Amino acid sequence: KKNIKRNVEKIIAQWDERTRKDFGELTLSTGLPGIILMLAELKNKDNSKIYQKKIDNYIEYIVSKLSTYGLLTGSLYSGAAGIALSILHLREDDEKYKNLLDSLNRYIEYFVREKIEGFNLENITPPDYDVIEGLSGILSYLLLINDEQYDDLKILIINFLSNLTKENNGLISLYIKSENQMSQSESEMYPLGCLNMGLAHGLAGVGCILAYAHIKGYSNEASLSALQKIIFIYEKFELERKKQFLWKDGLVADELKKEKVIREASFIRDAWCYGGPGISLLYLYGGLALDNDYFVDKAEKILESAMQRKLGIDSYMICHGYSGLIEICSLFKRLLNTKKFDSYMEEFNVNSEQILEEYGDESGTGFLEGISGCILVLSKFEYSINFTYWRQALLLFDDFLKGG
Ligand SMILES: [Zn+2]
C-alpha cells in the first residue's frame, strides 16, 4: 500500500507550514505530539531519515514554545504527559531527549501533587480523574517509567483514585453533579448529575488504570478493592436481554440507589471513549489482574457484541470511530491469542485504501480524531513492531502480561 506514504507527506507539509508560523498544536489530541508518534512509527519505511528530521524539527519547535509560554497542564491529551509520551522512545538516543523528558517528568510530578492538594470533592468533574485530562491518563504515562523515584507519586495517584470509589453522599464519590459536567449538553442531559461510565471520562478508565498499576507492582488492598467495586458496578448496571453487553454513558443517583437502571438512554454508541469496546478493556484487564477467567471470557463477548453491532459508528477515527474498535481487537488478539476478531481486522485492512482517501478533512490531522490516528492503526498492521508508546494513550497495554 503506497497510499500511507502520500498521505504522510501531505501531513508533513501541513505541519511544516504551521510551524513556520496556538495551544492546540502542542497537544496529543490534535497537535504535534500525535504527529511525532505517527512519523516515529514509520522508522522501517524508506523515508525514515526525512521523518526523524521532521520529528526533531517538531520537537525543537515544541521546546521553543514551552520555554516561551510554559504549560498549564500535565495532562495526557493536552499537557506534559502527552508530549513526554510522544518522545519517550527517544530517551536513550541523545542527552537532549532525556533532558527534555526529565523536565517534563518533574513538571508532571509538581503538577499532580499540586492538583491533589487543592482538590475539592464538592466540585469533582471528569478532567480531575479521567484519561483525557485527569490523573488516570497521567498515570498511564507514569507507569512506563521504571525509575523508583516516581514510586511515591504513583502511590499518591493510585490512593487518590481508589478513594474516589468510596461512598460519600451517604453514598457517591465519582458522581458528577449536573453543574460539574464537561459541557452544557451534558449538564442538560444530566440535570440531576450522573456517574460517568465511559472509558475516556468515567469509571472504566479508573478501573483499567488500577488493574494496570497492580500488574506493574503498584497496588494495595484498597486499590484492589476499588477495582473490584468498579467491576461489580459494571456487572450490576449492565443492560439486559436484547441489550446484553450494553451500558448507558451515565448512571443517575436514583438508579444507583435502586441498584437498577430506571431510565433508558436515548443514545448509546460502540466506541473506545464510551460504550462496549472501551468497557471490554476493564473486564480484560480486571480479569487478567484479578486472575478471574469469567471476566476475561466476558471481555471477549462484550467486544465481539460491539464488533458485530457497531452502534453509532460513522467514521474511522480513533476516539469514537472504527479504527479505535479495530485497535482494541488487535490488543485482545495480542494478549489472548484469540482469533475472534480476525475477520474484522482482515476486512479493515482490505478496505484500507478507501479508508484514507475518504477520510474527512474536517477531523483535522491529529491523533484522537484526525487522520494520523488512523494511519497509526494501519501502520502497525503492516509492520507490528511498535517503535513508540502511542498505545499507552488509549490504555492498550502490550506489556500487561510481561510482569514487573
Ligand atoms: Zn470519543
UniProtKB/Swiss-Prot annotation:
SUPFAM superfamilies reported in the protein's UniProt record: LanC-like
Gene3D superfamilies: 1.50.10.20
GO biological process, one term: peptide modification
SMART domains, alphabetized: LANC_like
Superkingdom: Bacteria
Family annotation (Pfam families): LANC_like (PF05147)
Function according to Swiss-Prot or TrEMBL: Could be implicated in the processing or the export process of the nisin lantibiotic.
Family per record: To B.subtilis SpaC and S.epidermidis EpiC.
Protein name: Nisin biosynthesis protein NisC
